[model samples]
Target: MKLAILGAGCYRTHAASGITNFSRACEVAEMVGKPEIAMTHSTITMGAELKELAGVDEVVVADPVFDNQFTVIDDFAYEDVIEAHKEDPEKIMPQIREKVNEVAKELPKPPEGAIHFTHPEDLGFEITTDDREAVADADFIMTWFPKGDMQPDIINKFIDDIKPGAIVTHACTIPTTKFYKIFEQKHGDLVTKPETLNVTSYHPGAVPEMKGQVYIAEGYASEDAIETLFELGQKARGNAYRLPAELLGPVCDMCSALTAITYAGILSYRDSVTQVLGAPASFAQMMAKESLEQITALMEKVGIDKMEENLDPGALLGTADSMNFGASAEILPTVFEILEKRKK
Candidate 1:
């Protein structure tokens, strides 16, 4: 699989933690199966500190700044070390630059020969048709939601152009509700909500790698298929990666469609509902606790004794019950932002 590590700036490249999403994506790929291609941005490719950590030999920078190859740290007295490091770099670089290669040895590196570097187009310009074609031709396509957000148009373009059966992977932390509201508001029904698994990721390569099998449709997977894919992803990482199949939760492929639809509805009503009332943190958590309980009640009210199917009316009742309390704390802000931006 040819995987493109799309990064916008220094945040994803230089940072030791918190911002290296591309590196996290690489961890995911290796956990699933080692990818054949690992393409990265020039800004990131140039970072000897990070590159060594990520272990990608073949890197293609989105926009290469040859003049200033990297933002290097230096010693400067009586000044902002951060600002001085960015300003007169050469004055402080030769010594540190000399030690960078040596220092990199102490830093973590991705798997051997797993990286490559290349020049790129302008910052605003996107990867070309040829770049995408390279991904489509490969067995898998691994890309981040560039710029920390998924532009539906770009997503639609890839969905249209990508080869069938090619897997697209991303590491977005926002809930499924935010995704549907953002894209559907912009492009109508061009993008349907896919079942999403939530993982807690604080930084790149910081946690045990995790994988989940998406059924792609509203139904249970065959026992054989479920066992096979889980074993396959697990075997890749051995005990190093965690699979969602290892979890026993209310959320599962069986209820995925219900989750998707209820999520969209929550986004739809987010604004109107949140405006009703606001509460303090303790009150808020208690309310959330109450909401989940209410959701269980709603499940019973709607004749859903147990969550067994992909789409269930019980889930809607559950959604309305829970999201109503959450409305004031989160969704109201989004709703207010949207309505305030609207023209009279």
Candidate 2:
């Protein structure tokens, strides 16, 4: 269904991944023929971020009410009721119930149709106390919970909450392949052609950080879904790649970290070359930041002459004469590779 329903699941910190996903959610909502709508519990700082940083029409604004106290009490003298329940189970049962009801009292708690959402008040929204009804109608739903323990509650509570052909996918570390596969195992015939789409953000781009690309996972995808992804990408000004889910999970590039290693090597070479050649660091070295800034475009226009222009003037002489093989000689640099390039 080429409409608009992007549920971006939970928000990561406004600092990193959440910015990308939540920002993408805004774009998807604006897109024509997308799922026709969207929302995420991970809204900028629990409805944070998107409201102020970007434009948000409406928020689901529900309760995420629910906690660890095992290490808590012993560390901070604990609480009275939990301690009472510890001493006598039957005698303290009703006592725990009264306190629990007191805590449950405090909790706060959407639907419907193609209405022009030029602004929030014209109202494309439908509020529902029933969370399942909220998700059940969405063709593309975003979801997630972390560390594996709590994730299953989504499936358990809403296993049949999905309408056929709907995609209920995760936002963070949980893979759609794993999530839907497990759903099928549980639902058997109950699960139909319901597909999954994964948008794996690389560094940033979707969120205004890097010029990064978002990887879309397939294998359980449909044409409308794939196009929906491309549309989502374009709307957000992101580049999207639809790869096999197998490849998607096994590999992805954060890009900067691995490049940092080579960049570090360049710095080391810069330091050593500058010291030996009596040249300043800038004279012998390319700024790591400067190199990466042009790295993408450099891939296309670069030629040997251009690359050579940036190559060190006498760094080879520095390494060669510097005489720097080490204790790990098995893997150490032998300079034969450098020698092979030089004419006899």
Candidate 3:
């Protein structure tokens, strides 16, 4: 466990711990002895501060450049793989392992000494040894069902490539784990087989109270960059939530604010901005008629409105709950995917 620092301002006092916005992740990282766990693009802007705030020595922000391999959607065998192979994993284990590794290969590996990645996609996308090595070296590996069993023979290459104590998890529509048991039976002393984590939060609408999970990527970013990103993220969320804030209750406000904090940290560590100039819109940061316009005017004064043309009218109170966290969640997966891609 390394040490890092993060600035907790008075604005955050109201919900620094209680709020659901971006601060929660930052707070959690800071509290968990990972204060400088963010990445940044520019060294001058966020390099020093990210480490200062997050209490970390290294920062990674290659979020935009890398190829994310966290989630691979293969419509071809996605359904058939899970349904046909679940009943007799022993028979189809070889085919299963092959497909799983194929999906895993598409993932990106982190830069050495960069942040740790906890998401299944990041785990799959990890880079260990050389590309020719088997998939066993991954910190964690997951795959959609219909792939095959957790057999040692199929994953022997993966096992041989893995470090001493890596965790291997999976995701599927069915229930099975014969393969992992075999590994445990054979290499009982070296590894503990594979355990699967549930993808409990996978709806287009159902909102989780907080970020159920976070996956860190690798790069050479800094804490200051994260803080700067927080500001930018908050601005984007504020814009995204302006319309919903008008019609929704305190929950909406809180959710939006928390999103700002979380996204701030995320974007700081990774560069997911679709357009930096209209960066607000990239995060669904919009402007409203009453308060938003005034804020936009202020932004213009400071030269932050270079990409005003891209602001969606819907983001500005047109649709129902336009910029809510639920919508924000819709975007989070893709952003994480992008970050995962860039590390390698």
TM-score of 2: 0.40
Better of 2 and 3 by TM-score: 2
What TM-score does each of the candidates earn? Answer: 0.31, 0.40, 0.21
How does candidate 1 score on lDDT?
A: 0.34
Top of the candidates by lDDT: 2
Off by over 4 Å in 3: 1-138, 143-146, 149-152, 173-176, 188-344
Descending-lDDT candidate ranking: 2, 1, 3
lDDT per residue (tens digit) for residues 88-151 in model 1: 4345334433444444445433211111222233211233333344444432333334333544
- On lDDT, the stronger of 1 and 3 is 1
Off by over 4 Å in 2: 1-129, 190-213, 249-344
For model 3, residues 1-344, the per-residue Cα lDDT tens digits are: 11111110111111223322222223233333432321111111122232443333432222211232223333223233233333432343344345434544444432211111122122112222322132333322322222344224344544444443333322222222343444454444434332221111011011111222211111211334233333432332111111121122222333647556554544432233333333554343332233446645766765654434444333433332333343344564555555454432
Local distance difference test, per candidate? Answer: 0.34, 0.39, 0.29
lDDT of residue 320 for candidate 2: 49
